[PDB]
Amino acid sequence: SEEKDPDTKKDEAIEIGLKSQESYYQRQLREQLARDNMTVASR
Amino acid sequence: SEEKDPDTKKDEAIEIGLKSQESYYQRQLREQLARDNMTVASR
Amino acid sequence: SEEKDPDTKKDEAIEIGLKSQESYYQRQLREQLARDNMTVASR
Amino acid sequence: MMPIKSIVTLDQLEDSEYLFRIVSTVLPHLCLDYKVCDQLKTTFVHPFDILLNNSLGSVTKQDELQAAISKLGINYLIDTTSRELKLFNVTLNAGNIDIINTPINISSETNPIINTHSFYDLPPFTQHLLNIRLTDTEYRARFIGGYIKPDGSDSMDVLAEKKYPDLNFDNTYLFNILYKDVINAPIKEFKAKIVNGVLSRQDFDNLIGVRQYITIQDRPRFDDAYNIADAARHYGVNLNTLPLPNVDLTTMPTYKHLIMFEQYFIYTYDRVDIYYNGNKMLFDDEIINFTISMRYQSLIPRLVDFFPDIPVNNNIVLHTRDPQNAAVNVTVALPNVQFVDINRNNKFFINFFNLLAKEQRSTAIKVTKSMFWDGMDYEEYKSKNLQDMMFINSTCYVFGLYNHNNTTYCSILSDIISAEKTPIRVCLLPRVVGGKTVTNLISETLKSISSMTIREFPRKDKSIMHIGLSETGFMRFFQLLRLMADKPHETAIKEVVMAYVGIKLGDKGSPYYIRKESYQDFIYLLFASMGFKVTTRRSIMGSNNISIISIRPRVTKQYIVATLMKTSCSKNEAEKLITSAFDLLNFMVSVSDF
Amino acid sequence: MMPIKSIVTLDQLEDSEYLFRIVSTVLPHLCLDYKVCDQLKTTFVHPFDILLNNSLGSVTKQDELQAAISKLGINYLIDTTSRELKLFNVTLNAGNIDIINTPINISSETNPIINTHSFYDLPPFTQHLLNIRLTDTEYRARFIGGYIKPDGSDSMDVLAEKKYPDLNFDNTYLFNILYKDVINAPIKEFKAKIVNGVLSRQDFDNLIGVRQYITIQDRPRFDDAYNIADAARHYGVNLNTLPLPNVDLTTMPTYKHLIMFEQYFIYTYDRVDIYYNGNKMLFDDEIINFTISMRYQSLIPRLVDFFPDIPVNNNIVLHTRDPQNAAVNVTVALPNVQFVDINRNNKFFINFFNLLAKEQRSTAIKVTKSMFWDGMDYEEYKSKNLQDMMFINSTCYVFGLYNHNNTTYCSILSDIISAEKTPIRVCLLPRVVGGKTVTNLISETLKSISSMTIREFPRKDKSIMHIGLSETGFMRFFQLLRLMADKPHETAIKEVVMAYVGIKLGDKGSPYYIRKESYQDFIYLLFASMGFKVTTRRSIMGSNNISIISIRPRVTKQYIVATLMKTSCSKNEAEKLITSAFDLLNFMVSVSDF
Amino acid sequence: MMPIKSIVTLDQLEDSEYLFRIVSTVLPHLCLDYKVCDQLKTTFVHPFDILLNNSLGSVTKQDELQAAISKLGINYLIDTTSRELKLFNVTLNAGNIDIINTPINISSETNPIINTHSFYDLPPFTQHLLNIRLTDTEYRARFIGGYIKPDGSDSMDVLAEKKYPDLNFDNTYLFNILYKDVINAPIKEFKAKIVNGVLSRQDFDNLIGVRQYITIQDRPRFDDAYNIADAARHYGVNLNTLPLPNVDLTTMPTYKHLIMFEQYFIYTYDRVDIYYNGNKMLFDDEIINFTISMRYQSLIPRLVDFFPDIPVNNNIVLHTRDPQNAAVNVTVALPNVQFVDINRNNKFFINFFNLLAKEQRSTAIKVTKSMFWDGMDYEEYKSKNLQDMMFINSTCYVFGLYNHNNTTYCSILSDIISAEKTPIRVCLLPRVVGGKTVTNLISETLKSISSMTIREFPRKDKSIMHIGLSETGFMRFFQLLRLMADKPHETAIKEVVMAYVGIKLGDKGSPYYIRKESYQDFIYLLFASMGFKVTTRRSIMGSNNISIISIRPRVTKQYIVATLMKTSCSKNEAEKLITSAFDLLNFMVSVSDF
């Protein structure tokens, strides 16, 4: 029963945290790639 | 044993009746289609 | 265990004998085909 | 203080030892005048057990058996063609039946009372049915066991959430399915019979019809799969001079063969093109809806009786192309014709029309109330006397029907009562030994002894080397003596006397001569089992180790007669027991001073 | 000289007769002050039995049960995704569990002690677990039965050659898996839930995410397999106005949906192309290693704790093509990022990361020592008194743990001892009847009788037509009287008295009025079972066949009190038995001169 | 009047309680001079049970076992390659055997006598064999159980409608098949062994030969499936410097590798073209008929002995093409060569030639008459004495062979007799406990007691805290005392005395010191079980609840000696029982006034 699995709310909190970490690493990635793109566009 | 299934004779009587009904409806069909073909050949 | 299957030595003796018979028949075969090849090369 | 599970229920031994408690723990408390209920003198056995082994039919009621055969035949065809969950878990092949080793599904609908019996004394399909009946819904059990509801208000309908249709007519389906000699074709859906090594005439003519509708490319693989060439040669039929089929639905003389192609062969061979009045048909769904409606027009209302929601229309739409390749929708609307849509389960509905068509040309089957299936009301059971309840619980398996979560279940009666459920009905299955119901064995035994005119008590004789039983009687009796122990002397006498008589009543053979070597040990076992104090004095006289057997109390007419009169309902009974056990009593009296 | 296998162990009957030996072969040797061990008042039942039938939870310890549910949930996911040999032999479906009919593998690792018990009295998964526990390694048994090692040094680790990881956190996996209403899609790997006839919101949003990564060609077959169109319409979602997915791994906002595609859908649908910073990716092995490492970066050390040998690197190499179709190897090395290679078993490692991620956001489960799993030390067992050993071996199944070939096995304790193996521990399972542990039934019975203030012994009354038991009490009692026989009179009295009281203690119903027809036979059975000499004089007076019942020795306050005092640990006990059995004793005294 | 199925046959308990009836219901009626039959001192156990667990071999006759191992090996190869219905229902894998969960086929050929035994005390393949033997034809049972017909006219041939060939020679097939370390290739037909982590030399050389005949396209998939590259590197073999195969059948030096390709590999890899004298071969059927005939020319007559109908010719026709692509039929006719056609079951006939070729280079196996398989004639059985029949029916499973519908069947002997069938022979299987046949245990026990010089009867001593048994002896004995009840005092004494001695004879350990806490309860159980009137006076003296144990009749040398002399065949026997039970009698006499 969708209403009455308490884990639905734990799991939302779990996904939010995973996507948050994932978004952070995706930003570190895009920042590294931005630094590298700018330096390649000048080397 | 082919000779000693009494149902072989019931089943023949059953098929004869089904094919008889089927032949009747096939004739009603061909009669309707004949009436329709003749009227289409004049409309 | 490869070292301690006594049948490995029986089986070697078996293969040797089978290949020996096989080699004999293969020779009878090639001898018959040699006789036939020489006669065809002259007929 | 002994362990618990040691009082085996009336239900977990072998046959010989399951005769012993009947002979020692039912028969000595029955008076000779006790009437066994007649319904209990036959028992249920599953039709499959009997079709494979006709001898098992002997303990059954013939009219219930023939009915069950025809009924199972119908139920199986329904279930087998159903897309719903199979209620059967066996496969009927040519000549044999496979019990399928299905996964044990366990769900909210499993009988919430666990079954603690294994039923290893019953024939395998009978045993299998009981396992299902006790673990599943009563509805499933009745369906697979070929139950027919008897005429009368006292038949009980069982709660179940879903049910198949309930057709009932005489038929030979099981004999046709179980026919041993069939072509082992890659398509198993058509069981082409072999008669005298050649494909049957009926099947040959059928397949010849179907062949007309197969493509030129696939005909070789078809002809090979059914050995048509040999059959044609044997039946004189020149395949090359068969006519082209009339592929136009309007002038086609019978749809029978086209329907058979659709039913058994479409999924393996390519068909020729089908036409309506010169236009090519675009959908096989439309072809099958048209042909079935035309062939079975008279049964459509009767189909609607089981399937109200099934679409029935006064017209049908056929999507076609003209020869000029233009899409033409033909709406067919014939006077007094109706069209049914069967697409969502064509194979089932085609087979269902065949069942209906046969039913319309067969008689319905009537049956009496079954003590196995319908049983008795729980109040009627509780109204019985204490001896009847002892007899039932000592000669039959005893079951109850009960309701839970809007479903009827069956379980052993004790376990329903223990689970604090209320039984609605009590259902019985008389147990069987030596090809008879035990109930009937008892009935016959009591009658036979009762019928004996009383003879004189035997006089002491010399050199009696037999107890009148044959070899096979003597050996059964001897096994039973090894099981007779520690009982009160007077009762032990009556029990051994009744054991002898129960065997003697089936004992066709000439008397068996006890071997000299065995003779003293037999004397010992017989008197010890009866609870006489046997005393074996070994005296060494010279080199010889003489054994003298002394039995106390002394075997005398007064001692035996008095001992049996205590344990008998009347003096007449005691004298009729003495009369039936004459040879044994002649032996005993003749060896008592040995 | 009777046959051997006739002393059935405490373990092969049905329930009613397994109550009889408790009542006749444990309870009359216990003094009313005997304390049953509290650990034995609950018993183990397998979580599957209880999830399908919650009533079976009643005899279990709740805190061990909830723990086992969550633990099994984890173990099953590990095993199911493992490429190694499955330790489970059941399939959890929607609404039901299938026991799989696996081939009986027999090897050098099979328990060298054969199991001689069938356990047909236990719920089917409980029974199934025991069969495995006794034939296989103890490691397998603990894993499938959802064992959690309790806190403390006295929990024994079991020798086994290979083991799965041991995660432990609260979860609802089993309730989700066993959810009855799911789309029956051809791909069973994704159990899309149906709520109010429509695919669930959580699943719909998930599938909508996944759909973005499916090709234009395959989207129709996907949308059909999960009925996405209806779900979209119901959820207001216009599929046509969904955005194009960001297929570049660098700017993709979540890898969640791409990972789900790889986990459940790659093996059935074609994917769109995936890019890294404008370059097309060449290998899915690289895509799955990148996305998982980025999504679960924080758990990589914790994975290495279970799998030390798993490759973890400070960089990854992605083989790509530029838009100009030149092969470009991109080496990605982000500050404070590590990359794990999961190629061996992607499906397992993806699921393992999910378990770890949930564990990091769940509490760990704590449990007490289980008498079923952990048992007691063999020395501790041998230190017990003779009555405790009789009670245990008469109310519980009794198992031992032993080592052979560097593996721990479990077998019945007698069989370990008989195979000259040394038990390390003794494990117990209290047997159950009528929804209670038998141990607890005894505990309650003893307590109740002990608590009774002593009443006067009943005085002789007229026309007592009941023994105070209800219908269901009376019928259980009557069955038990048919089993009571041949015992010493004094003991037979105490056993029948204790039987009555044990039933009376659960007997909610108004007294049952013995039918007049049954009344004499009941009198006979009751006094005969108690070992009184019942004498039934049939005297023909005129046309009437009068039966007079004479019982010896005479039922009197002194006779009963004296007889019970011999068989009781104290006079107080005898008087408390008399007090608890008052109605029965009132009946007896009132019919003794009948 | 208790229920029926309660005298459990000699066949449905566990081990300890199946020792109890031997000790209480065989041993006290045997005189110390009774000779157990020597054939009964070993028992049959199925070779599979022993190959996996060598300890089970201990109760078997070694010469029957080695024979059965070699015989099963042959029978399995025949059956496995047969296209006919498999007589085996197990799969022999590397390191393990799977019992296959085959559907229960039920037919007109099923044994018409139902089997009412479960045999849960027997090793799993032994148990499995018995189930088959009792439900199926005796022919099937003998074939799967590796029966060899013994030398002599008294070996009975069994009626069956069809039979496999009967080859008999020593071999190691089962040890090779069950070898644990093999490459898990997708083709299971070739079990390539791994030795020291690398494919075996014999298999490597074989596969290298086969590889030559695989196409350039398929060689990679082959080399990968068997890890040929590593094996080649390990064996120093440069694959690149292997020669081209001689693909011409005329100058090919051995057909061995081409035949192996056809036997194990054709169904998975493409072959190179094969030539005859320069012409390409058109049919693999012709290639396999030629190569086999040439390789096994000497065995063709011996094949015809089993298969008379098999086509053998003095020539063969090979359909070929010349290099100019013209069809040329070559008729090959070589001096003193014959050609056999094996096409309709090539895989079987190739394997059958290998069996014949090995038989021609192995010795035949000779065996003695098996009491399990051949048994004794039914008349010979019936000629035996009453004690022998009691001993047999109390230490062995007892079977009979009987004929019905021109087929021989086996069933339990009672059930043949009950079904009014006539047994032809009686077959026996001595039951096993603690790794010995029970028959032999009895033989040893009787011998040991008989051999004892008589000692003095023990004198009354102080503070005896042991009965001389070890811990494991004492605990087995204590279990047995809990099973000793209600028996006549004189007999109960002899039975308990014989129980002690039977344990004492296997009791390796130092005496067990009865714990002070247990000591009174042990005294009670021991004298109560022996049927002494134990009287426990509880007297409250001050605050202390003193228990005094009084045993009647008094334990004295005269009482015991007199009591045992009544129950013993001679005075000498009574004194030898006293001598063997010395420690126990010393205990008893020392506690009788306690």
Residue numbers in the entry:
A (entry chain D), B (entry chain B), C (entry chain F): 24 to 66
D (entry chain A), E (entry chain C), F (entry chain E): 1 to 594
Question: What did the authors write?
Answer:
Vaccinia virus assembly in the cytoplasm of infected cells involves the formation of a biconcave viral core inside the maturing viral particle. In contrast, A4 and A10, which are essential for virion assembly, are accessible on the surface of intact viral cores suggesting that they are palisade components. Moreover, A10 and A4 form a stable complex that can be cross-linked in purified IMVs.
We found that most of the density in our palisade map is unambiguously explained by a model of the processed N-terminal fragment 1 of A10. Ordered densities that would account for the C-terminal fragments 2 and 3 were not identified, suggesting that only fragment 1 of A10 is a structural component of the palisade trimer. In total, each inter-protomer interface consists of approximately 2,285 Å2 of the buried surface area.
